[PDB]
Amino acid sequence: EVPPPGEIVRPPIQLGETYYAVKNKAIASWVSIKVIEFTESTAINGNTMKSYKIRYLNTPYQMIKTVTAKHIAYFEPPPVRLTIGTRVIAYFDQSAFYPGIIAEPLKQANRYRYLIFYDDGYTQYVPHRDVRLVCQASEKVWEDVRDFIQKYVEKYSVDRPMVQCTRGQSMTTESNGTWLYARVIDIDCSLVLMQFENHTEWIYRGSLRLGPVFRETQNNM
């Protein structure tokens, strides 16, 4: 099921309704909540500010918190397909909803799956049924994630350096700030499965974490 294009609607948050919100750390998993209160503040200059008292669902004791609509996401998937730069939560396969940004829309070229650049740095092709929209849009969506996601979206180009690879080639690859020897063991459209030196990772073929991309990006700049 491929949704049609159209306007992305962000309906207001309704009291007593179920949503997803940050559990602990913002970059980490988002879980089921019920909005139990709506708070609003207005200053002399006229700038309003909205906050939400949320209650976590399925807990051992009552857990309540006050968050912003930027830390809440809808419970059901959008009725229309999403585009590059849209801030979402996507079901990552621990298996959970993690915050991210749409890096590729539904295309024939990617078998109609969104490429997700997760906040935590993980990347995955997720179907439309596994994404949820964050309740509040960000003008400069990088201000919400990290410095790569700024250059990717603000200085976006279809002509960005991407590695072209084949199962069995090797290249220097960055893992937790360390450049290591890694081997191409699988490829899935814009993603490449790199096996370090047991230790495997799906990395974006246009990532600076791959030695040849880094050089190519320095050579052009």
Side-chain angles (χ1 to χ4, degrees), residues 10 12 15 35 37-38 54 78 81 124 168 180 188:
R10 281 176 227 249
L15 275 150
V35 173
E37 211 182 74
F38 172 63
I54 65 163
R81 66 178 80 174
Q124 196 163 109
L180 295 160
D188 180 11

Side-chain angles (χ1 to χ4, degrees), residues 16-22 24 26 28-33 35-46 48-49 51-52 54-63 65-100 102-121 123-137 141-142 144 148:
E17 301 315 308
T18 296
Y19 293 86
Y20 289 105
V22 311
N24 50 90
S29 77
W30 291 35
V31 285
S32 297
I33 64 99
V35 173
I36 63 158
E37 211 182 74
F38 172 63
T39 299
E40 205 183 10
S41 294
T42 304
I44 309 181
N45 53 78
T48 60
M49 218 166 68
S51 34
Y52 301 89
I54 65 163
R55 172 162 63 80
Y56 293 94
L57 311 174
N58 198 29
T59 52
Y61 52 90
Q62 195 192 258
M63 295 171 197
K65 206 176 281 169
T66 303
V67 300
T68 288
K70 264 159 180 159
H71 292 107
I72 304 162
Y74 302 102
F75 195 72
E76 288 304 301
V80 293
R81 66 178 80 174
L82 313 175
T83 58
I84 294 142
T86 305
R87 184 101 176 90
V88 297
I89 52 165
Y91 197 84
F92 178 87
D93 191 57
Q94 77 153 10
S95 277
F97 276 102
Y98 290 95
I102 298 302
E104 280 170 9
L106 306 172
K107 290 186 287 163
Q108 173 234 303
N110 60 16
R111 298 185 256 115
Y112 307 95
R113 291 167 309 160
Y114 295 110
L115 179 67
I116 312 296
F117 287 167
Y118 284 103
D119 271 28
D120 55 22
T123 189
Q124 196 163 109
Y125 272 119
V126 180
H128 188 90
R129 61 189 180 271
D130 289 337
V131 303
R132 311 295 182 267
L133 259 169
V134 164
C135 293
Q136 193 179 32
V141 82
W142 44 90
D144 295 38
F148 170 90

Side-chain angles (χ1 to χ4, degrees), residues 5 8 15 68 90 167 170 181 204 208 215:
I8 284 154
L15 275 150
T68 288
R167 265 150 278 239
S170 273
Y181 175 107
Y204 175 57
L208 299 167
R215 189 183 243 132

